């Protein structure tokens, strides 16, 4: 409950975040800005560069989508491992652990996705490639509409200039949301989130002392996340109806089953 308890929690989460997520914001920024700690990506900006890129790194929009499913499944695996490290999470009723993961994992995906983006495109294939926003926008409907709202969010989110240590606490706050539909015991979840929110506030005060009220502004961003999810779900429903040769991977299918 004291500051030292809050710092210890911040430290624990950052340590777990680094252990759980092999591609950090620090690495993403090093790739994107040309630092010598990391290597230059191959840039895919049209159909030709895409074909050459697969060699360097079934309509194309569908192949890209199926690749997205696999990255997303990996993301869920990483996020689940991380969630289990949040103090108190694995002590919750198992139904609630499942519910929290079900509603939270994509909110986390879009949050961390911002780390891989700038206004012009997104890192892919563990940072080995970079696919432009213009190219993704050019994919046939409805595949061309998947990424744009995520890019719009990312530009706004990236303006906050958070680092990995900040993000570690923020994503924990997202997971421990007491307002998820169908939760059985809201209070112990809120008890954990209250601790995480305090730890995040202190972390932001110490790590960005010249960023006044960064905490409140960060919380402002969480509104956009649920809207991204809502819009995304509508696009998935279209795909389900128009592309019968495809289904979501079973883990993703479970996540979206009876969501909202
Ligand atoms: C059906 C599916 C897969 O639809 C999606 C379509 C597009 C997107 C956005 C781009 O896909 C990404 C997949 C993984 C990403 N990042 N990886 C991590 C890993 C660990 C932690 C955080 C992020 C980024 C983008 C997403 C989904 C779906 O809804 O699952």
Residue 208 known to bind ligand = no
* Residue ranges of domains in the chain: 1-260
Alpha helices in 94-158 (DSSP H): 94-113, 133-137, 148-158
| Residue from 75, 135, 164 whose mutation best tests the ligand 1 pocket (most atoms within 8 A of CB) | 75
Any ligand 1 atom below 6 A from CB of 252 = yes
Length of the chain, in residues: 260
**Does an H or E element contain 19, and which?**
helix 3-20
Q: Distance (Å, rounded) from C-alpha 71 to C-alpha 68?
A: 5
Method: X-ray
Rounded Cα gap, residues 79 and 236, in angstroms: 21
Q: What one-character DSSP code corresponds to residue 42?
A: E
Between the alpha carbon of residue 101 and those of residues 29, 66, 131, 178, 225, the distances in Å are 28, 22, 29, 12, 15
Query: 1-260, superfamily in CATH?
Result: Retinoid X Receptor (1.10.565.10)
Nearest to 50, CA basis, from 67, 73, 69, 37: 67
Asked whether the beta carbons of 142 and 235 are under 8 A apart, the reply is yes
- Spatial separation of the C-alpha atoms in residues 92 and 6, rounded to whole Å: 21
Cβ–ligand 1 distance for 151 under 6 Å, the answer no
Give helix then strand counts, H and E, for the chain.
11, 4
- Measured distance CA(58)–CA(217) in Å, rounded: 43
In angstroms, this model's resolution equals 1.8
Sheet of 129-132, strands arranged across = 42-44, 129-132, 121-124, 117-118
């Amino acid at each position: 409950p004291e500051s030292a308890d809050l710092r210890a929690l911040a430290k624990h989460l950052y340590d777990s975040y680094i252990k759980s997520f092999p591609l950090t914001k620090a690495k993403a920024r090093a790739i994107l800005t040309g630092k010598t700690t990391d290597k230059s990506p191959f840039v895919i900006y049209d159909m030709n560069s895409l074909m050459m890129g697969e060699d360097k790194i079934k309509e194309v929009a569908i192949r890209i989508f199926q690749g997205c499913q696999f990255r997303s499944v990996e993301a869920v695996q990483e996020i689940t491992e991380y969630a289990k490290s949040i103090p108190g999470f694995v002590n919750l009723d198992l139904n609630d652990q499942v519910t929290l993961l079900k509603y939270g994992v994509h909110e986390i995906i879009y949050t961390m996705l911002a780390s891989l983006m700038n206004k012009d495109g997104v890192l892919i294939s563990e940072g080995q490639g970079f696919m432009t926003r213009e190219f993704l926008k050019s994919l046939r409907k409805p595949f061309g509409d998947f990424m744009e709202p995520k890019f719009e969010f990312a530009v706004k989110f990236n303006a906050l200039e958070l680092d990995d240590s900040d993000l570690a606490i923020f994503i924990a706050v997202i997971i421990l949301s007491g307002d998820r539909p169908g939760l059985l015991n809201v209070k112990p979840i809120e008890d954990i989130q209250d601790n995480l929110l305090q730890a995040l506030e202190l972390q932001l005060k110490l790590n960005h002392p010249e960023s006044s009220q960064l905490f409140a502004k960060l919380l402002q961003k969480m509104t956009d996340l649920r809207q991204i999810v809502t819009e995304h779900v509508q696009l998935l429903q279209v795909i389900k109806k128009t592309e019968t040769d495809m289904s979501l991977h079973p883990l993703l299918q479970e996540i979206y089953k009876d969501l909202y």
